[PDB]
């Protein structure tokens, strides 16, 4: 089906405690594949996925060069924004930037992204047309006008429609065993005595990839959304994800409840019952 490529960048100022902290990571779908951390010893872009570890020295030296350039525009950015907001030199501030692309099931270009946030709120974003900008703040307008005059969007559209999509599907065929895989959830239920008249039924989905999944409970085939405790899909640490959904069942009513699991790794969706 569809695929995406994304780069996330975070810079945090450390007033007095040295130069700003910069962290960069890249993902293809739910799999991280590269990182750069400013405080790390190597000062190089590093592999984080087995399939990218065999790219050449040209790749690694070129990406190290470009990621460090990104580090430095962000450290100028920290000053610029402190200026736009007439803020003190004493406080720590965060700039975040994300850009990347999506391809459809035919693997053709579908969406492109380029956006910034300052201290955790939207600052400026390239719109879907990849010809205009959304700036909310009055300070953000300097940036909007600047980038308009300088034709920033034209450079960005060019990359997002060309290079981004091109290397995404290079990564897709070069990492096909990982990226074109699908691990189906291993499911089970647990039953715990809450009291003399109630018990929790928890439905588990473990070891699945990709992270998207729908896990729901029903009582006689109807909605139980307000009545289900559902946790956030979490990483197991080995590249798969986990999730659970729980309902408190009145004693003697276990047979009324069903757990439903939808995941693209399943040949058909599961309906599970405690019995």
């Amino acid at each position: 089906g569809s695929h995406s490529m994304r780069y996330f960048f975070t810079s945090v100022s450390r007033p007095g405690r040295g130069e700003p902290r910069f962290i960069a990571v890249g993902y293809v779908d739910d799999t991280q594949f590269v990182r750069f951390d400013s405080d790390a010893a190597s000062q190089r872009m590093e592999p984080r996925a087995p399939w990218i570890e065999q790219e050449g020295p040209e790749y690694w030296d070129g990406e190290t060069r470009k990621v460090k350039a990104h580090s430095q525009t962000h450290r100028v950015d920290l000053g610029t924004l402190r200026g736009y907001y007439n803020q003190s030199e004493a406080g720590s501030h965060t700039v975040q930037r994300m850009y990347g692309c999506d391809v459809g099931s035919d693997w053709r270009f579908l969406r492109g992204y380029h956006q910034y946030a300052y201290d955790g709120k939207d600052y400026i974003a390239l719109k879907e047309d990849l010809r205009s900008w959304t700036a909310a703040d009055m300070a953000a307008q300097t940036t909007k006008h600047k980038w308009e005059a300088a034709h920033v969007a034209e450079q960005l559209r060019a990359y997002l429609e060309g290079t981004c999509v091109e290397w995404l599907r290079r990564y897709l065929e070069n990492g096909k065993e990982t990226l074109q895989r699908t691990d189906a959830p291993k499911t089970h239920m647990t039953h715990h005595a809450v009291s003399d008249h109630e018990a929790t039924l928890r439905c588990w989905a473990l070891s699945f990839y990709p992270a998207e999944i729908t896990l729901t409970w029903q009582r006689d085939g109807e909605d139980q959304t307000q009545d289900t405790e559902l946790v956030e899909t979490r990483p197991a640490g080995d590249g798969t994800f986990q999730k659970w959904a729980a309902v408190v069942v009145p004693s003697g009513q276990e047979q009324r409840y069903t757990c439903h699991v939808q995941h693209e790794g399943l040949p058909k969706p599961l309906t599970l019952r405690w019995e």
Partner: peptide, 9 residues
Amino acid sequence: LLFGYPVYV
């Protein structure tokens, strides 16, 4: 592969 042109706010 990263974008290669500097952008400054």
